[PDB]
Write a protein that binds this ligand. Structure first.
Ligand SMILES: O=c1cc(O)n([C@@H]2O[C@H](COP(=O)(O)O)[C@@H](O)[C@H]2O)c(=O)[nH]1
Ligand SMILES: O=c1cc(O)n([C@@H]2O[C@H](COP(=O)(O)O)[C@@H](O)[C@H]2O)c(=O)[nH]1
Lengths: 219, 218
């Protein structure tokens, strides 16, 4: 599995290149893995991935939550990996053929898929929660190794860890702004994803250092 | 929304030259183009403005937004800043995520298309069983525009029943995925067609042929 420094992944959802580069540079001593999603990519272009690699040499997870039919999923993955992303996130709810399409491209291109199981926001309870255990099991059957699950529901995150096993890699958003606790989340997740608590801070470096101090005994 | 010939082109070519050329070849037949991530991630969000400059068509950004509400808001703002007239949004992530998109669309004078049931086989695993409830959620939220599957006309008909005749319904899966143009237009206001046109030896003839087959419905 990827070796994420300090078990902390920055969710870089600022939408201006200058601010995104500044904040990421400020926390680079603490974080070597950055999640870049559509807020930044649709604002600044896929070349933002290139710029991050050039400036910081951080791993990049393209958080695109791929959720189309298999043929379109393949195209999205190909374009994303062409641009230099190490990994891409994929929704499981559109079913196994859609996930397999992404896995096939990732295999061909030597990159990784992260399967999004249950989401962290309140609306996730309407439809996603009820499907999440089966989505996780589907991922295991398909050979998925990397997963995303919610910091905001420790009981659900624990169950998802059970389903995927200790050998699978699990990252977890919802820490800080959405209410999840870093230490508690790391009981189950390999790494926590943190966005606003860092990037909206007066001193993002101090914010990251503070989170790390709070989980020091967990590495 | 008034769609010319009830036909929306799904422009999923990934090369700017080809996408512009093929869209140009069929321009006399359409006034609405769906642009998705294959083209946008290959050529940039600036491609939306360039389609407007070249063709004047309306643009649906088929981004199937499927994040938390805070992130959905940002995705919608970026998309509408690029000149999209409408955006597609997954209903599966729940009502707060949909409302986030509806709020931005209202602020910027655009439309949200709610994706209810998808057209591919995998849709049967989780989406299909939630689809009627997703559509009712759309109705509760005041959603006026919906997407449902050409590949399952009985499901498309049910979706139409739920949302009523006043709502606007567009439907992909025509042609390549096996859906029939005429049957789909029994229920949908417009059909989405990608590969059957853009991979055709002669895309203009392909579009002309589809329109000929539904001429009595226009
Ligand atoms: O279930 C999920 C899955 C996500 O990818 N995310 C993403 O993780 C990040 C959370 O950032 P924040 O720490 O500001 O709440 C955002 O980029 C969001 O899109 C999430 O919040 N919940
Ligand atoms: O359920 C759905 C929803 C979609 O947006 N689509 C989209 O509609 C288009 C169908 O293209 P095609 O006619 O080549 O099969 C693609 O852009 C696809 O992403 C779909 O096929 N099924």
């Amino acid at each position: 599995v990827m070796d994420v420094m300090n078990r902390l992944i920055l969710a870089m959802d600022l939408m201006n290149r200058d601010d995104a580069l500044r904040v990421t540079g400020e926390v680079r001593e603490y974080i070597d893995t950055v999640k870049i999603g559509y807020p930044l990519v649709l604002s600044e272009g896929m070349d933002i991935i290139a710029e991050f690699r050039k400036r910081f040499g951080c791993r990049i997870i393209a958080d695109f939550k791929v959720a189309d039919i298999p043929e379109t999923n393949e195209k999205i993955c190909r374009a994303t990996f062409k641009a230099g992303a190490d990994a891409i996130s994929v929704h499981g709810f559109p079913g196994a053929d859609s996930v397999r399409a992404c896995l096939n491209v990732a295999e061909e291109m030597g990159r990784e898929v992260f399967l999004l199981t249950e989401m962290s926001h309140p609306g996730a309870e309407m439809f996603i929660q009820g499907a999440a255990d089966e989505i996780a099991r589907m991922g295991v059957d398909l050979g998925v190794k990397n997963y995303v699950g919610p910091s905001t529901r420790p009981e659900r995150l624990s169950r998802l860890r059970e389903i995927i096993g200790q050998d699978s890699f699990l990252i977890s958003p919802g820490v800080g702004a959405q209410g999840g606790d870093p230490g508690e989340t790391l009981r189950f997740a390999d790494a926590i994803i943190v966005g606003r608590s860092i990037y909206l801070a007066d001193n993002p470096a101090a914010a990251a250092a503070g989170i790390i101090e709070s989980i020091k005994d967990l590495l």
